Every structure is written in C-alpha cells, then in structure tokens.
C-alpha cells in the first residue's frame, strides 16, 4: 500500500539485514517515489541496497567474460558464453536505467544541498560508467560522455562547497579517477586525480570530524591503494616520518 | 536447448555464481527424464543447496530480530510477516526439490550410491521445511524425514564403504537430524562416532588424493562430536 516512509525504511533495514538487497531496493525505491528529499540515513539505504543489487551483475558479467575469451578456440563454448553475457548485460543495463530513472525524477532535481547534489551527481556518473564497463561498438562513447558529464559536474560543485576530507568529496575523487585509468585510459590523470584528492585531505586534516572519521579515513586508503597499485613498475616510494 | 547445453551453462553459472540460473537449468535436465551423472547429480545439489541456503540464512537473522523485539508490537508484526514471506520462498524451494526427487531422482535411481545420494538429499529437504514447521504438520514431515534418512542409511550400511564421502555426509546430517529435531543426543553422537570410527580405520584411503571430499566430512562429523560431548573440563590446545 502507500504505507509511510518510516515504515518503508524499517522494512528496507530487515531486508538489509538478512542480506536480501532486491528486497531493500525496492523499499527505498518506494521512499524515493514519494519525492521528499532523502535523509542521509534514507540515501545511504538507497545506495548501498543498488550497490549490492548491480554488483552482483557486475561481477558475474566479468567471470562470464572471462571464461569467453578463455573458450575462444571453441566456438560452442563461446556462443553460449557471450549469449549467457547478453543475458547478464540486460539485467545490468535495467538496473543501471533504474537507478538513473530516480535519480532525474526524484533525487537530482529535488537536491538543495551541495552534498546531496554532489552524492546523486556521483552517483548518476558511477552507474554511467557500469553502463560503460558493458558498453560495445559505437555505442560506448555516448555513454561514457554522460558519466563523465556527471562525475564533472559533481567535481565542479564539490571543489567549492566542500571540504578535502568530506567522504562525499573524497569518494567523487576515487571513483572519478577510476573512470580516468579504466574507462577513459588516462592514467597520468587518474593518478594526478587521486595524489591531489588524498593530498589534499592530509593538508586540511583539522577539518575532519568524528562522524565522518571513519568514512573519510577508509577513503583516503582506497586512494593510495590504487595509487600503490598504479604507479607500479617501477616507484611507489616508501612514506617516513619525521 | 539440449541436454549437454544445459548443463554447459549451469556450470557457467556456478563460476558466475547465479545459483538460481544453475538450479533452472540442472532442473530442466532432471526433468528430461533420464538418469543423472555423478557431475550433474552433484550440480543439481550444489545449485539448490545455494537457493535453500540463502533463506534459511536469512530465516535465521530475521526470526533473530523478530524474537528480540519486545514491547513493539508493530515492529515485531512486521518482522513476523516478513520471515513469513522467506518461510514461503523457503517452502517453495524445498517441494520443488522434493518433487523432483519423488518423480525422476529417486525412482530412476540405478545403484545404491545414487539411491542413496538422493534419499539423503530426500531426508534433508524434509528437514529444512522441519526447521521452519510448527503445530500438526511438523510432526508428519518429521517422519518424511527421518523415513528417508534411514531407508539411505540402511542401504549405505549394506553396499557402501565407510569411507565413501556420500555415506560420511549421511552419517553427518542424519546424526544432525537425530540431536536437533528428534531431540535425541545419545544417538546424534554414536551415530556420528561409529562414521568417524569406521572411517578413520582406513585413513590411508581418506589421504589420497580423491578423498578430500572425505576429508573434509570428516572434519565436520568430530566438530559436531566436540561440540555435543564432552567441552567441559576441556582445556585450549596447542601445538610445538
Ligand atoms: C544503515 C546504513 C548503512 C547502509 C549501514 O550505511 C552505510 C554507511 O553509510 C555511511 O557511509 C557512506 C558510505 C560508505 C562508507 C565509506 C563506509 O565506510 C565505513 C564502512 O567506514 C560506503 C557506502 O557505500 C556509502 C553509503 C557511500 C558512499 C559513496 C556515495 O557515493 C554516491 C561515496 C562516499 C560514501 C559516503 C556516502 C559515506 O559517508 C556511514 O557513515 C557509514 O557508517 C560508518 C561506518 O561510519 C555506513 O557504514
Ligand atoms: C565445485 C563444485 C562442483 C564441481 C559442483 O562439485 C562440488 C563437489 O562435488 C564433489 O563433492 C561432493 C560434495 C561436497 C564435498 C563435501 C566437497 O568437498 C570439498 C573438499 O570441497 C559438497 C557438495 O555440496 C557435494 C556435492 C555434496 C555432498 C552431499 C550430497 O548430499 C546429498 C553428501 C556428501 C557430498 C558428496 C556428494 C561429495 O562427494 C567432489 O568430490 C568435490 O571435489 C572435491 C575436490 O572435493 C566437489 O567440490
């Protein structure tokens, strides 16, 4: 039924809990729908619920992908892997047209807030870019201009409003630089991106609060992780202090 | 889409982890009508065993909530209907295994290791609707289950070594069965015990190479055996 928005969360937070993230989805879904302005408790359920409901295509189409061009020299092995992908893809472009349909309906254009902005605009790019991940032929180069109109966006307003360490800013730098070295093979800047995100919190470390400790400092280690991971061959200069 | 095709794909999606894509595809072989392959026999069960397992997990968690939310009443009604609702997709998972077992699995069923695979996975089913039944109908499907259970493990007894893994797995969760819903612990533990004693006398065969199933049920039968006997007077162990 049109049942209240608090009911819907509490239903979303036992889904949640029993790892039943189709189910959470569609509570929060339901919460969107109403069009008020998510909490950031409300936002948070959204994502991480979608979060859990396009990974589990994402990392399918990747092993499913992997096993095609492992039975390459097979071509009844082959078919039926690239069909099984074709499969998967459909799942994951519906998901990804979801999310995106929320977020130009409800959640963008009902954003009063530079954080809240900056959050659906992250978001809007991060589900572009999972259309990107799947994207083939000609078609991939429009899509792949919307996520990065998005993450841009996102920047532009987060570079005035918000503070280095703020999670919000910091995970908008992680993934936007992700998008760089992986959709765009532009690893100078992806590296750039993530050394002046990180740096950049180490420089106004006073702005750090404790609600957003433990956020903001997970961030900035999956910034020097994939640093770490990319400025291999050579480098990666061990860190002293004194 | 033939028989060698579906079970192609229900390995591809074993690797992809999409069990239910696994169960659809091995059910529709079973429902070809022909006998099972060790292989597809095994990833028929794998498959179902990820579908049932992830609402008996999420059974578990949600009957958790709904037990410890007192004096709120809304909440606790909501969290009720809710491990309702899993209970459902729970049941419906288990009478489609159980239908499959009863119309092609068990009848078409050629040597004992395959009778018993299936009368065990019979035995199991029956125990998960156990798990979640309650007032008169608990009672008959309690019955359905350990009727399955020993008719496997008599046949087992008769044509298969103690050191088959389908014969350990038995032993282990019908001793399961008999601690946990038959509320009989004395015969949960020899049950268990004479499986592993029989077994560990011929643990040159559970080290080779083919018996790391084996192995690993072993594993399981003495954790349970700790768990229930003993762990009293029992001290930390270590090992230089
Ligand atoms: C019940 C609510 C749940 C679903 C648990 O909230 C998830 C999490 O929600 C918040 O954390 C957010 C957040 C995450 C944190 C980095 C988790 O950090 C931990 C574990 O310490 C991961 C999530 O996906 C989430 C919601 C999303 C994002 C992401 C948004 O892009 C659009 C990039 C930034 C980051 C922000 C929004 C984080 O503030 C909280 O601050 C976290 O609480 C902690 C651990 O401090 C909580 O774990
Ligand atoms: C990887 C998955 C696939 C390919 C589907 O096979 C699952 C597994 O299938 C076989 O293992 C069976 C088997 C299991 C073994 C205990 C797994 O052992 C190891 C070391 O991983 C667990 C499975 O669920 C399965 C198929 C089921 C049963 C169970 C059936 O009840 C009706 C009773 C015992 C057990 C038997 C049938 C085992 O022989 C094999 O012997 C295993 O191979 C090894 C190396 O142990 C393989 O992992």
Same mark, same amino acid.
């Given at each position: 039924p049109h049942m209240d928005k608090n009911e819907l969360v509490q239903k979303a937070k036992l889904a949640e809990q029993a790892?039943? @993230?189709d189910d959470m989805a569609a509570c929060m879904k339901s919460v969107t729908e109403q069009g008020a302005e998510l909490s950031n408790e409300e936002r948070n359920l959204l994502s991480v619920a979608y979060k859990n409901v396009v990974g589990a295509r994402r990392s399918a189409?990747? =092993? =499913?992908?992997?096993?095609?061009? *492992?039975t390459e020299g097979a071509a009844a092995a082959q078919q039926m892997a690239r069909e099984y992908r074709?499969?998967?893809?459909?799942?994951?472009?519906?998901?990804?047209?979801? =999310?995106?349909?929320?977020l130009e309906?409800?959640?963008?254009?009902? /954003?009063?807030? &530079?954080?809240s902005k900056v959050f659906y605009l992250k978001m809007k790019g991060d589900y572009y870019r999972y259309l990107a991940? =799947?994207? &083939?032929?000609?078609? *991939?180069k429009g899509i792949v201009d919307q996520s990065q109109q998005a @993450?841009?966006? /996102?920047?532009?307003?987060? /570079? /005035?409003?918000?503070?280095?360490?703020?999670?919000? #800013?910091?995970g $908008? &730098? $992680?993934?936007?630089?992700?998008? @760089? @070295?992986?959709?765009?093979?532009?690893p100078e800047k992806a590296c750039s991106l993530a050394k002046t995100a990180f740096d950049e919190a180490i420089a106004e470390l006073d702005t750090l609060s404790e609600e957003s400790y433990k956020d903001s400092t997970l961030?900035?280690?999956?910034? #020097?992780?994939?640093?770490?991971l990319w400025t291999g061959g050579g480098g990666r200069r061990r860190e002293t202090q004194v």
């Amino acid at each position: 039924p049109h049942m209240d928005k608090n009911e819907l969360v509490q239903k979303a937070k036992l889904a949640e809990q029993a790892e039943r @993230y189709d189910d959470m989805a569609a509570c929060m879904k339901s919460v969107t729908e109403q069009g008020a302005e998510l909490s950031n408790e409300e936002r948070n359920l959204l994502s991480v619920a979608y979060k859990n409901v396009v990974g589990a295509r994402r990392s399918a189409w990747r =092993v =499913v992908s992997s096993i095609e061009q *492992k039975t390459e020299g097979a071509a009844a092995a082959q078919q039926m892997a690239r069909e099984y992908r074709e499969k998967i893809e459909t799942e994951l472009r519906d998901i990804c047209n979801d =999310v995106l349909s929320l977020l130009e309906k409800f959640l963008i254009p009902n /954003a009063s807030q &530079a954080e809240s902005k900056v959050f659906y605009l992250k978001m809007k790019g991060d589900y572009y870019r999972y259309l990107a991940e =799947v994207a &083939a032929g000609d078609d *991939k180069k429009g899509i792949v201009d919307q996520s990065q109109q998005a @993450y841009q966006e /996102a920047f532009e307003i987060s /570079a /005035a409003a918000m503070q280095p360490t703020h999670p919000i #800013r910091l995970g $908008l &730098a $992680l993934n936007f630089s992700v998008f @760089y @070295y992986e959709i765009l093979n532009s690893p100078e800047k992806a590296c750039s991106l993530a050394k002046t995100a990180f740096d950049e919190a180490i420089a106004e470390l006073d702005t750090l609060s404790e609600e957003s400790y433990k956020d903001s400092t997970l961030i900035m280690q999956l910034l #020097r992780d994939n640093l770490t991971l990319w400025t291999g061959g050579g480098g990666r200069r061990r860190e002293t202090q004194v």
